């Protein structure tokens, strides 16, 4: 399965993680779970070229 990346641009907490999934929509569920539970949710952007989501708090 394709690999999707998550870049977390938090005010204090910053990092990156990945998940493998059938498509970006499916991967995004994991990433939303992650950002929400870690209190670093914010504005989302998706880049199809790099299969990367960025969330900026």
Q: Which domains does the chain have, with CATH numbers?
A: 1-57 (3.10.20.10)
Determined by which method? X-ray
Q: How far apart are CA 29 and CA 51, in angstroms?
A: 14
Instruction: Determine the Cα angle at 25 with ends 27 and 6, to 5°.
Output: 40
CA contacts within 13 A on the Cβ side of 2: 14
Q: Residue 40 phi/psi, 5° resolution?
A: -125, 25
* Cβ atoms of 55 and 42 closer than 8 Å: yes
CA distances to 1, 8, 22 from 14, in Å: 26, 5, 26
Containing 27, the helix (H) or strand (E) segment is: helix 24-37
Residues in a beta bridge with 46: 53
Q: How far apart are CA 36 and CA 51, in angstroms?
A: 20
CA distances to 4, 28, 46 from 20, in Å: 6, 10, 15
* Cβ atoms of 6 and 37 closer than 8 Å: no
């Amino acid at each position: 399965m394709d690999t999707y990346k998550l870049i977390l641009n938090g005010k204090t907490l910053k990092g990156e993680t990945t998940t493998e999934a059938v498509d970006a929509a499916t991967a995004e569920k994991v990433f939303k779970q992650y950002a929400n539970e870690h209190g670093v949710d914010g504005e989302w952007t998706y880049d199809p070229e790099t299969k990367t989501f960025t969330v900026t708090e």
